């Protein structure tokens, strides 16, 4: 009776401390990058920000008239439907995947708000091969307690910062089922994003697209 | 709307070239991703620097230093035609280098049915002296006594009275 | 259990359930209240206003 209430109360405070620690980390990382860029500019030096280990990929072309070589990759990316968004560990083994499914998907660097809103609204966990909504921290705790992930904030951190267990967290998240964008795509959507279309890599504009889709 | 971007990049450092030269271009693009893509295409086509072996060290948007002063810009361009080989120089009078680039793209697409890819910007300079100003219409805009009637003056359907369509 | 899905962003109560930290967040902080140091190298300005 009292033991479970005390343990859960202490667990609640522990999550609060972790979330406070994570929030400070994001603020410090953003502030320190700004300070580094400011000092480089003052000295005349050029500062290169680090590569983004995280990418968010949205499938923009349907299941019709797609070559088998490209189809298998979206099967491996769990992009089995149009307007489906997933997190991918951006590395040298993924850059080549996304370069050959350039005409069929779009991707970019998601900021903290994009990841935070996606898991809050579209966050569904794969529990016993079922799509269970992440409606409470105990759902995540029983499914990711081995990797010391206890709450939604812990899951957001493990996804945003690409921690050691990013593969387990990304595989736990059922692919986000995003709606059609509010306001629509561009006039011609299947042209490359650079050439005025809406396909391929788009860097920090994946956020502006995702907010439409949420 | 286009945005002027200063783009600086270099190849990845290696024992052969521990200090590669930093190449900087001033090119116009709607956003940063397009600007970097156009930079890499230009670098490959000029210095044969591979996009794969390179990286981007600095990107900075450029605002017009004096956006409230009327200026005349001369632009060199290498347009691609059926033969894919042309080079022209055009003059535009406006208050922003971005505006002159915007006007040039609209003009070339209107006359020669060009595209963003068929057009490559070669050089943009600000011609400040009426002596170096060449085009007749630009000169007749820099005349001291410029004055002319306003042309093309032009729901609530079913107007009850005839339009004045004059002063 | 969980007959209906409630969006934490639009539900202040569900947000409290999921994230026991939103009760103390302090979103807006005033940090530009000291002498704003205009930090721009002179050589950088020349390179910026080049050509």
């Amino acid at each position: 009776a009292a033991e479970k209430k005390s343990a859960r109360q202490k667990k609640r405070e522990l999550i609060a401390k972790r979330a406070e620690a994570y929030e400070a980390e994001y603020r410090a990382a953003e502030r320190e990058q700004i300070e580094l860029a400011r000092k480089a500019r003052a000295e005349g030096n050029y500062f290169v920000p680090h590569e983004p280990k995280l990418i968010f990929v949205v499938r923009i072309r349907g299941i019709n008239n797609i070559p088998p070589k490209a189809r298998k990759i979206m099967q491996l990316l769990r992009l089995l439907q149009i307007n489906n968004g997933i997190f991918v560990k951006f590395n040298k083994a993924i850059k080549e995947m996304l370069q050959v499914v350039e005409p069929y998907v779009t991707y970019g660097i998601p900021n903290h708000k994009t990841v935070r809103e996606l898991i809050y609204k579209r966050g569904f966990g794969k529990v016993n091969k079922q799509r269970i909504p992440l409606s409470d921290n105990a759902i995540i705790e029983a499914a990711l307690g081995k990797y010391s992930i206890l709450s939604v904030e812990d899951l957001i951190h493990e996804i945003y910062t690409v921690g050691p267990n990013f593969k387990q967290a990304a595989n736990f998240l059922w692919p986000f089922k995003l709606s059609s964008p509010l306001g629509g795509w561009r006039e011609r959507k299947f042209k490359h994003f650079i050439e005025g279309g809406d396909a391929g890599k788009r860097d920090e504009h994946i956020n502006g697209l995702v907010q439409k889709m949420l | 709307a286009l945005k002027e971007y200063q783009v600086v990049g270099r190849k990845v450092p290696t024992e052969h070239e521990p200090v590669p030269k930093l190449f900087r271009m001033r090119l116009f693009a709607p956003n940063e991703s397009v600007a970097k893509s156009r930079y890499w295409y230009f670098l490959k086509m000029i210095n044969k620097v591979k996009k794969a072996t390179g990286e981007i060290v600095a990107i900075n948007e450029i605002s017009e230093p004096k956006p409230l002063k009327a200026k005349v810009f001369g632009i060199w361009i290498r347009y691609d035609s059926r033969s894919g080989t042309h080079n022209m120089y055009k003059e535009f009078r406006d208050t922003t280098r971005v505006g002159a680039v915007e006007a040039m793209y609209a003009d070339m697409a209107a006359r020669h049915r060009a595209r963003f890819r068929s057009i490559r910007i070669l050089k943009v300079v600000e011609v400040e002296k009426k002596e170096d100003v060449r085009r007749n219409y630009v000169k007749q805009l820099l005349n001291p006594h410029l004055k002319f009637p306003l042309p093309h003056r032009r729901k609530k359907v079913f107007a009850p009275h005839r339009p004045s369509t004059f002063y | 259990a969980h007959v209906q899905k409630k969006n934490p962003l639009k539900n202040k109560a569900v947000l409290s359930r999921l994230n026991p930290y939103a009760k103390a967040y302090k979103a807006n902080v005033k940090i530009n209240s000291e002498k704003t140091p205009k930090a721009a190298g002179e050589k950088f300005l020349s390179v910026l206003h080049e050509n």
């Binding site: 990058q33 580094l36 480089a40 005349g44 030096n45 050029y46 500062f47 290169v48 920000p49 680090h50 | 600086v8 200090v19 030269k21 930093l22 190449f23 900087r24 271009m25 001033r26 230009f42 670098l43 086509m45 000029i46 210095n47 060290v57 060199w76 290498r78 080079n87 490559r120 910007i121 070669l122 050089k123 | 390179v47 080049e50 050509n51």
Partner: peptide, 18 residues
């Protein structure tokens, strides 16, 4: 991230060639 120095690495401006 990492830092790169421009000391004795002044940037050369480049513009395409006709």
């Amino acid at each position: 991230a990492h830092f790169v120095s421009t000391e004795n690495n002044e940037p050369v401006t480049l513009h395409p060639v006709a």
